[PDB]
């Protein structure tokens, strides 16, 4: 009635697309747009510029869109499910799992080279599932008890990660340290051939729950009186999150404030209705990450800055801003 923001959505879309083009035309391997268009058009003189665009630079752009989109949408969903803007897709323990999955592989062994995201993926989901099972009671899931189960399993996980880091050598240390810092330098097409449908699915389960999510943000008991299966929905949202965020962190490492920032902006821009906030967040998420990952590729080139670093230089003024906002 009082809320016409589908132009906000459509704007975020245009800005995202626009940013995508801009990311494809910059910058480390120096290609002027004229060689960029010739390369895409099949000119044999631009044969190497084309391989860069399609084999190095396109997979990183599409991965940045998947990462940012996946974190915005699961931030949107977590914060509705916990009715707190501070809930973060990691609370399931997927993030620690992936860390533990990845770092036990880097430090023990073995196989290669798409083995790193599979270990990270199975580690996330397993720690996710364990954290769930410890909190649920067959079958009622309290969200306070989810947090305690999380604090506890992340304690256990973190020790196993600490022990591996300890017995690791200098090569293996170099790998953990950078794996956990975040990166998209890996990105190639076979990787995100797998990841993309994983987070494509998660986003479908989440959009399929948006109306039940809105009722939920009114009251757990209130949603229950309106007919929402509050127990079945917690389990449904949590799986979908653990699924897209699991696939994501498995091949990007740990990042990094986007799942908090993007939903909170669209919620400030358009209100909390899950029907707008999830696409809005996914959209603004993908936009902010691409922008971040672009800056990492080029701000200090040929250094490739971990993008965990840049997305924190985003969360810092954001949290500093909503400090300044809420002084009263």
């Amino acid at each position: 009635s009082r809320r016409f923001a589908p132009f906000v959505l459509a704007a975020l879309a245009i800005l995202m697309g626009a940013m995508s083009v801009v990311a494809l035309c910059v910058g480390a391997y120096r290609i002027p747009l004229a060689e960029a268009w010739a390369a895409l058009s099949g000119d044999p003189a631009a044969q190497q510029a084309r391989a860069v665009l399609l084999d190095i630079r396109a997979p990183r752009v599409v991965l940045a869109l998947l990462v940012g989109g996946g974190f915005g949408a699961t931030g949107a969903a977590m914060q509705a499910l916990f009715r707190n803007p501070l809930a973060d897709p990691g609370l399931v323990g997927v993030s620690s799992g992936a860390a533990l999955g990845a770092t036990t592989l880097i430090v023990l062994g073995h196989a290669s080279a798409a083995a790193l995201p599979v270990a990270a993926f199975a580690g996330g989901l397993a720690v996710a599932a364990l954290v769930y099972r410890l909190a649920a009671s067959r079958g009622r899931l309290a969200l306070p008890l989810l947090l305690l189960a999380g604090i506890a399993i992340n304690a256990l996980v973190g020790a196993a990660i600490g022990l591996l880091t300890f017995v690791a050598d200098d090569a293996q240390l170099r790998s953990l340290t950078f794996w956990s810092l975040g990166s998209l330098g890996g990105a190639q097409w076979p990787t995100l051939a797998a990841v993309a449908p994983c987070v494509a699915l998660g986003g479908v389960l989440l959009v399929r729950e948006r109306d039940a999510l809105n009722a939920l943000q009114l009251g757990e008991t209130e949603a229950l009186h309106l007919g929402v299966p509050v127990q079945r929905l917690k389990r449904r949202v949590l799986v979908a999150v653990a699924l897209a965020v699991g696939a994501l962190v498995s091949c990007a490492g740990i990042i990094g404030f986007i799942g908090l920032v993007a939903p909170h902006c669209v919620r400030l821009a358009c209100g909390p209705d899950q029907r707008i906030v999830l696409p809005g967040a996914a959209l603004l998420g993908a936009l902010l990450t691409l922008a971040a990952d672009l800056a990492a590729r080029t701000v200090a080139a040929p250094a490739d800055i971990p993008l965990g670093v840049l997305t924190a230089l985003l969360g810092a003024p954001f949290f500093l801003a909503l400090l300044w906002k809420n002084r009263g």
């Binding site: 009082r2 109306d211 809105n214 009722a215 943000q217 009114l218 309106l226 007919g227």
Partner: protein
């Protein structure tokens, strides 16, 4: 009718051999001191304690228009009863329009249709809640009194007549100012009479229950110790055992309870 017959709820037993019936068209007010079990009995009529939700054990019959509550899906149940709770400060800054529309959630067909009838009902419910001035507002700039009119709007929206239902009030009337409290229990009675709706309301001030209730159930220690019209039930001996409070009655031009 909405009926408990020989109800037990159980940590010992909080409700012991309780039998009460909510009649369509009439408003039953529920009295009792703190801890008497009022809020449990009401949760029980909602169906929060019977079905695929709970470890607390329940015995005896509870019936909505003829069938055991436990056989009524939470979706279907959301169309025969609604619950007006209390501490409505929302977790996110929805609009008024959105809160009320959420009352049409159990009816919205596709999943969250937001059809045109639904936006009308939402407007007409805000109308009878006396909250139509608040269209547009952020629910977090609303005084507790305004918000309380909006939550009433939303619960009416869910019960709106269409194509006998039950309204359960969980102390809706407290932390409203005086004029406000009488306004709401008058409208509730009117709606109950006009839509043939069964109302059970937990009320603190027994004098307030006396003016607006067709029936009063005084709940003392897990059991209903008086039931019937405000005239017969409201007596010094009854107030005595329900509340431990020595009172007397006094007349007007409905009779008022007074201490000493």
């Amino acid at each position: 009718m909405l009926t408990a017959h020989h109800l037990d709820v159980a940590h010992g037993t909080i409700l012991r051999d309780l039998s009460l019936s909510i009649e369509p068209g009439r408003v039953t007010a529920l009295l009792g001191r703190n801890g008497a079990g009022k809020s449990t009995l009401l949760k029980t009529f909602a169906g929060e304690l019977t079905g695929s939700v709970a470890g607390v054990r329940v015995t005896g019959d509870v019936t909505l228009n003829g069938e055991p509550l436990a056989r009524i899906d939470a979706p279907r149940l959301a169309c025969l009863r609604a619950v007006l709770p209390q501490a409505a400060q929302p977790a996110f800054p929805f609009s008024v329009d959105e809160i009320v529309l959420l009352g049409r959630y159990p009816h919205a067909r596709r999943s969250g249709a937001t059809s045109h009838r639904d936006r009308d009902i939402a407007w007409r419910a805000l109308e009878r809640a006396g909250a139509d001035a608040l269209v547009g507002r952020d629910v977090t700039t609303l005084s507790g009194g305004e918000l309380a009119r909006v939550q009433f709007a939303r619960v009416l929206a869910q019960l709106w007549p269409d194509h006998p239902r039950y309204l359960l009030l969980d102390e809706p009337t407290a932390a409203l100012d005086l004029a406000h409290q009488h306004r709401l229990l008058d409208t509730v009675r009117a709606v109950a009479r006009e839509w043939q709706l069964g109302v059970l309301a937990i009320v603190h001030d027994p004098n307030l229950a006396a003016r607006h209730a067709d029936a009063i159930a005084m709940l003392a220690d897990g059991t209903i110790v008086a039931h019937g019209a405000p005239r017969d039930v409201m007596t010094p001996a009854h107030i005595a055992q329900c509340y431990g409070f020595a009172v007397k009655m006094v007349e007007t031009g409905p009779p008022v309870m007074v201490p000493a």
